[PDB]
Design a protein around this ligand. Structure first.
Ligand SMILES: N=C(NCCC[C@H](N)C(=O)O)NP(=O)(O)O
Ligand SMILES: N=C(NCCC[C@H](N)C(=O)O)NP(=O)(O)O
Lengths: 344, 352
């Protein structure tokens, strides 16, 4: 079942630096030319492409067609970064070829005909790129990619023209945020051409201290060079976060243990919590788990509950519009329950 | 021995009338002994003779159901031990800190504390759980007469018992109740009630009397009038105002439940969440959270936490008792870590 908001067995595996790096994501955007039926209609191209993947994937993959999913199922796929918002809503023949472990997602008929996604836990960009490239090679053996031998892969949005590659890592940087170093690392990332965004919240507030660092640097660099560059910056960010964490432990000791356990205590017991406080507390709890203060709570609580406690998702899940105070009560209840599952 | 290592005696652990709000009822009777100068004037020789008088008369003396009296001399106790007795409300800060020749006769059940060389030669204290002012006054008056069979009180027909303090003039009677008034505090009402009560000849003080703060919204309501009113009327008048206070607190709770609803449940559970999980907590925060949790158990929000454990924790988390329980002296930051751990384990054993 792909619509389990919990961290998959695949994404809960401990990849390199997976305490700080939640996940590594490789996306390869492709468009197809010279269709098997040279149709003039996008409708027909989109259906041939779906037929291709339904015929060619029955490793176990399920082809999820957006037209066949309830809106909450599509929202979960969106929140799992398995599909884009555009695939859920705006793609009449949108479909997602999902591997059973949800490592592999091939979005069909979005902006581009093909978006191959590999999502790995921890810092495994090279592994994700290799896995995405193996599917890329498989797909290209059966279709012709729109490709200009001097411009590279042709993608609908010129955001991707060239390699069609977007590489991203999601990182939890509570210590850099706590010690107010985060706005020091943003310029270093921007100078290198990478893009850093908060994953959760509205415009740059980065709830949960979860950051997405991705490339933008396109035409010049090889895919391996894009990924090596991102990997290298991520490893420096990891080192900075670990240094900040170790400084925090050495300075605060029991006061840091107290901070993360109080955040735990709020999450385990509060009856009213807004998404911002929940995010801060979840980040603290995750840090406390990472530091081994909190020993009986899965670190995946951060990944899962950051999704489930978002205001819009919470309403989407509840099936209706909820006032903020109603959201805060349901959010607290959801969080308490998920932490009660950990106590058992 | 057990005076220092049990936070709440079996005696004080009994549920009393209205004991959810009224934690305790106390009657103190101040007296001086004829032929001894009062503690503000006496010599060290007189002070020692006073202790010796009470020692000879009352050490190990049986007092019925209360067990026998034990004599604790302040000079023979350490400041932590004395702080423990203050924190258990068995002796006054004055006796613990300001009476070199102070002593206290404690009943084995810790209902009775006869302080010696406090502000007066004798401060007879009877402590009852819940709202039991009539029973405490009866107990104290009985004990007063019983003691007076062994000492003669300085007494003037006009001025009553001659005491050292203007605040004991006449009856020497201080009747007090300890009340948990979290709703009146939260509704801001307490701000109007305190001056209103002060104008009726009562006074509202903190948890450890004059000059102390209301730890955990625990207020001491006591008479201010000691002279020109019978002891029964002083206590009856206090009781009447305590009953009104209970009524106001209960109404304030119902008002809070209706106006805050889940936010009140959130308030108490967050305090519970702190207590169950914090690793560092000072006694003041602990008291505030314990107050919230007590309110939460009173309103039925919080299950599996007894008033008994909350009573124990209110005492165990005090600095002296913490150091007593620890085994020795603790700096503030050590206290806060041991306090958090004590609370966590008591709350976790409370929920198992
Ligand atoms: N915005 C809210 N709640 C509003 C409460 C006011 C303020 N945040 C407070 O809690 O004090 N919830 P959401 O689901 O995170 O949007
Ligand atoms: N006075 C204190 N603590 C002072 C603050 C120390 C701070 N929590 C810290 O960790 O240093 N505790 P007490 O036992 O209530 O007297």
């Amino acid at each position: 079942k792909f619509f389990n908001t919990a961290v998959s067995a695949w994404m809960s595996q401990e990849g390199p630096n997976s305490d700080i790096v939640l996940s590594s994501r490789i996306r390869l955007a492709r468009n197809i030319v010279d269709f098997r039926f040279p149709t003039l209609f996008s409708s027909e191209e989109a259906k041939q492409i779906v037929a291709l993947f339904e015929r060619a994937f029955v490793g176990r993959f399920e082809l999820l067609k957006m037209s066949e999913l309830q809106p909450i199922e599509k929202r979960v796929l969106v929140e799992k970064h398995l599909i884009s918002p555009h695939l859920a809503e705006d793609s009449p023949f949108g479909a997602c070829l999902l591997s059973e472990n949800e490592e592999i997602s091939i979005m069909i008929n979005e902006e581009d005909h093909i978006r191959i996604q590999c999502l790995f836990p921890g810092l495994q960009l090279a592994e994700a790129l290799e896995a995405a490239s193996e599917l890329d090679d498989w797909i290209e053996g059966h279709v012709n990619y729109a490709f200009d031998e001097r411009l590279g892969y042709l993608t609908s949005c010129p955001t991707n023209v060239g390699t069609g590659l977007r590489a991203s890592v999601m990182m939890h940087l509570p210590a850099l945020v706590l010690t107010q170093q985060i706005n020091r690392i943003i310029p270093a990332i921007n100078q290198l051409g990478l893009v850093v965004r908060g994953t959760y919240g509205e415009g740059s507030e980065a709830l949960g201290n979860i950051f997405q660092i991705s490339n933008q640097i396109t035409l010049g660099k090889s895919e391996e060079d894009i990924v090596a560059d991102l990997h290298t910056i991520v490893e420096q960010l990891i080192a900075q976060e670990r240094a900040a964490r170790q400084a925090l432990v050495k300075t605060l000791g029991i006061q840091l243990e107290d901070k993360v356990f109080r955040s735990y205590g709020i999450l385990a017991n509060c009856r009213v919590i807004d998404s911002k406080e929940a995010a801060q507390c979840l980040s603290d709890v995750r840090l406390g788990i990472d530091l081994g203060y909190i020993k009986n709570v899965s670190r995946n609580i951060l990944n899962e509950l950051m999704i489930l406690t978002q205001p819009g998702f919470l309403q989407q899940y509840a099936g209706g519009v909820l006032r903020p105070e109603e959201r805060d009560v349901r959010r607290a209840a959801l969080i308490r329950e998920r932490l009660r599952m950990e106590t058992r």
